[PDB]
């Protein structure tokens, strides 16, 4: 409730600049963070070659292909020698990485007095992951307004994202499918997840509307110690099932765009082997039209599930929401399940 | 190739990272370019207040609302005085454009009440017109266009195509122009504004990934034009009876080319007609070898200067080459000076 100020084109021009300066800040903040990751691995590489010279080990042949904390892969070649010397030179190799355990793969191919022993070292992963999902559209036809994806990023972590958006058929998929495709590439870079969401949230800021773009739900399970990073930027609830318990995780923040200041909060939970992480969109959680308490209804539905296969769990919950109606589907429905259990190699 | 590249996921993610550093590079360069203009507007502002002070009227309460080379608008307060001569030097220190007067003398009394406002001057009036059509002749077309004015200095016109189908391409075309409508509005170098759009739209590292673009910028200062073409989409200029075609060798939007986009400049005068079309109109007539010579004879047959009629009478004539069929999305934009 102010004056007129009808010469407002300049006020819009300089305001759009701050939108372009704001996103340029998170891009520069992303550039210095990835450069910091380049300097750590480079410093780790220098520290590794000095440690070899000092310890009584032979530098007959060496090749370093890549050195990420998740995907550790280096190759060496040393004289044949004898006994457990191929692995007791690895004890300092674990300590030089300071964080990761290293295993040995020794390929000795020289049935002659001359020494030709080629060896490769790789990272170790714990907790094997099993996946499965169920998909459904509002009209049950062709393409749904909800999009999901779940891919593994090397050895360390398994990712799972779900995006919603608008309710229209074509108007919501092209906007929801693009979010996951943009997230599927930014998460592949190996950047901090809390920063990766601000970077996606900044790029997708368009028109300065309310609830502009695709809401999203990201869950990343670290295989190092079976920890999870619950990132909710779509305000969609998620659940964890351990035997017969059902623990609900939720977070306060608004959809993707520039709807909130001071970005997105992270939520962490600790799980063990045999646990079941199920996620759904708003079409399943608010699916049944004749239900008041959607939290108790979703908890009791899982306690009746008597299986550990993640594929069946996604379907028995999906069709149970359909059972509450006369086969009706009043909204786009999507559910993703992930199970955790050790490798036991 | 080389080895069997077992753990390519490491080599494939370092490449995706470098793609994301490239767009982060032009974004930091975009920030330094607008900061350069913000330091230019600030350095000129300090240059203004000392020149305004040295005068028998004193600065009093001068108000500078905004000072970009396109929209110059400032207000001052001066004594009643009598017989605008303070604006001829005010135009010289800014070193560009021209300034007009707008001084209204309120209170016809020997008081010192007198408000004044100064604004930029624009030359060469623009006239617009376009024609729209869908692939199946339906409601949803794969081509999207827009033509808005950015203050006083320039009139813009963009056309994007993309895929052939109506649904898969309507989102990619509508998104390109909406993203272009915000990057051009910020006020930045046109050559750098294109590398900003193309870097953001780099996704999946495919061939001919996203929407091809056709940008035409008409400067109202001296009637110069900046032809920016991403996708080798031809355009034409009509002056009386001449038909000049502009083209560029660069490839569609994405990261399909290195060393960014070449800029093309042209000089036009009054009465000229800038027409633009997508690949659905230029390749409209299917039983034609030379699409350029065919399009040239069609414009010499156009006998009107109304930009709206030119867009329809050219589009409807492309339909006549077929049996009323529309084999692809069609879009044409006409601009007169």
Explain what you see:
- Chain A: Residues 130-340 form the PPM-type phosphatase domain.
- Chain A: This is Stage II sporulation protein E.
- Chain A: Residues 1-345 are cytoplasmic.
- The structure is a homodimer.
- Chain A is of the alpha+beta class and 345 residues long.
- The first copy, chain A, has a domain at 128-341: Phosphatase 2c, domain 1 (4-Layer Sandwich), CATH 3.60.40.
- Chain A is built from eight helices and 15 strands.
- The longest helix of chain A has 46 residues, at 9-54.
- Chain A binds chain B through residues 7, 9-14, 16-17, 19-21, 23-25, 27-28, 30-31, 34, 65-66, 68, 71, 73, 153-154, 170, 174-175, 181-182, 185-186, 188-190, 203, 206-207, and chain B through 7, 9-14, 16-17, 20-21, 23-25, 27-28, 30-31, 34, 65-66, 68, 71, 73, 150-151, 167, 171-172, 178-179, 182-183, 185-187, 200, 203-204.
Tell me the CATH superfamily of the domain at 128-341 in chain A.
PPM-type phosphatase domain
- CATH architectural type of the domain at 128-341 in chain A: 4-Layer Sandwich
Largest sheet, strands/sense/barrel of chain A:
6 strands, antiparallel
What's the helix-strand series of chain A? HEEHHEEEEEEHHEEEEEEHHHE
Q: What structural class do helix, strand and pairing data of chain A support?
A: alpha+beta
Q: Per the principal axes of the C-alpha atoms, what is the gross shape of chain A?
A: flat
Top-tier CATH class of the domain at 128-341 in chain A? Alpha Beta
Largest interface: A-B, 40 and 39 residues
The CATH topology of the domain at 128-341 in chain A is Phosphatase 2c, domain 1
């Amino acid at each position: 409730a102010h004056l007129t100020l009808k010469k407002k084109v300049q006020d819009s021009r300089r305001l759009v600049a701050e939108q372009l300066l704001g996103v340029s800040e998170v891009m520069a903040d992303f550039s210095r963070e990835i450069k910091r990751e380049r300097e750590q691995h480079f410093l780790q590489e220098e520290q590794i070659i000095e440690a070899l010279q000092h310890f009584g080990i032979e530098i007959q042949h060496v090749e370093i292909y890549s050195l990420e904390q998740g995907n550790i892969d280096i190759e060496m070649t040393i004289p044949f020698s004898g006994h457990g010397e191929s692995e007791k030179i690895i004890a300092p190799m674990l300590s030089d990485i300071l964080e990761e355990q290293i295993l040995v793969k020794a390929e000795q191919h020289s049935p002659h007095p001359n020494g030709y022993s080629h060896v490769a070292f790789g990272s170790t992963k714990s907790y094997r992951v099993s996946t499965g999902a169920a998909h459904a559209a509002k009209g049950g036809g062709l393409v749904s307004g909800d999009s999901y994806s779940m891919m593994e990023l090397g050895a360390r972590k398994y990712a799972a994202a779900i995006s919603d958006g608008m309710g229209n058929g074509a108007r919501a998929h092209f906007e929801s499918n693009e979010t996951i495709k943009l997230l599927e590439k930014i998460l592949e870079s190996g950047i901090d997840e809390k920063i990766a969401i601000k970077t996606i949230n900044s790029i997708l800021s368009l028109r300065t509307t309310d609830e502009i773009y695709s809401t999203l739900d990201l869950s990343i399970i670290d295989l190092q110690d079976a920890s999870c990073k619950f990132l909710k930027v779509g305000s969609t609830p998620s659940f964890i099932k351990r035997g017969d318990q059902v623990m609900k995780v939720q977070a306060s923040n608004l959809p993707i765009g520039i709807i909130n200041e001071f970005d997105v909060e992270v939520v962490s939970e600790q799980l063990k082997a045999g646990d079941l992480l199920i996620m759904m969109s708003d079409g399943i959680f608010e699916g049944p039209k004749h239900v008041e308490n959607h939290d108790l209804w979703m908890k009791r539905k899982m306690k009746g599930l008597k299986t550990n296969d993640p594929q069946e769990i996604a379907d028995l919950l999906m069709e149970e929401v359909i059972r509450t109606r006369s086969g009706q589907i009043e909204d786009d429905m999507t559910v993703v399940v992930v199970r955790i259990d050790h490798n036991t190699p």
